[PDB]
Amino acid sequence: MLYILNSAILPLKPGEEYTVKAKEITIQEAKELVTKEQFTSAIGHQATAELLSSILGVNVPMNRVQIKVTHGDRILAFMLKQRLPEGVVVKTTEELEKIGYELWLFEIQ
């Protein structure tokens, strides 16, 4: 399964060791992923869900579910380019864009 997350987090299933390949991808590559592959959104932030949905032209909903990734899964991670203090919640898509972000693809095995 491909999971869409809004930090470069690896919520790995315990009991195993993993090798994870990681690279940055473009919005266009992300669009290809979410248009051609099954995916589950685990985005926990509404403005990020809205930004991604707008820039990818796909419905990427906020879905505050706990997930565990295992062998064969992939993660498309939205990662802000600056670290924010804990508790700080960005309110607008414009702020996310001005802070800047990267999309990373992690492939788990």
Added chain:
Amino acid sequence: MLYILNSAILPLKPGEEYTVKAKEITIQEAKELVTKEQFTSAIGHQATAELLSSILGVNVPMNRVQIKVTHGDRILAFMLKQRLPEGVVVKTTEELEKIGYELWLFEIQ
């Protein structure tokens, strides 16, 4: 460099692709790491810093710095066993322990 982080995050330096090995480690293994290796704490949460410092018997300070990890770096990640809503900041070490946590070691190349 070994970095100590309080989520299973991979703040990877852009411009490269990575292979990352990941496994869960024990508190004792973590103690060995932070006692025998150079390390930089990037823990952004005081109660987590205090919990880790207490259970490892080493000074792991809160240090809200932006970091970027690259080839040859390692990350010791504190990861809570349940996902909390964004903005929610745990106030006590007792709550962290009752939610439960895992320590993961990521080795980047």
